[PDB]
Design a protein around this ligand. Sequence first.
Ligand SMILES: *C(=O)/C=C/c1ccc(O)cc1
Length: 125
Amino acid sequence: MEHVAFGSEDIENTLAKMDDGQLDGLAFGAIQLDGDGNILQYNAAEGDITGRDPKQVIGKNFFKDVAPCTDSPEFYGKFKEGVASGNLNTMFEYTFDYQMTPTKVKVHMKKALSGDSYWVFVKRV
Ligand SMILES: *C(=O)/C=C/c1ccc(O)cc1
């Protein structure tokens, strides 16, 4: 397991250093999106929660295709606001329920160090 806690203050720095196998070693789900919501990275822990194949969701749109329950002011709205302001860093509870059993989670969204890149981190609650 990679030695990284969900919600860490410097999580973006740690993950900037990681390859795919490393991201798959995290204790929590990790998705990297571009500013339009297209899926750049998706780790094994996230697929364990959602039943999505991390190898195949890459390239799809998280808000339009994969996770319509997040296409809402409460999730997508916060993403959009943080992308626009340039300082995305927000945490909230949510329920994921499209093509998976309804699952309560805690979500942390945070701007990545690489350009036009934004993390969505997920753990069960
Ligand atoms: C609601 O439709 C949420 C769906 C979902 C959330 C997170 C994922 O990684 C995959 C699907």
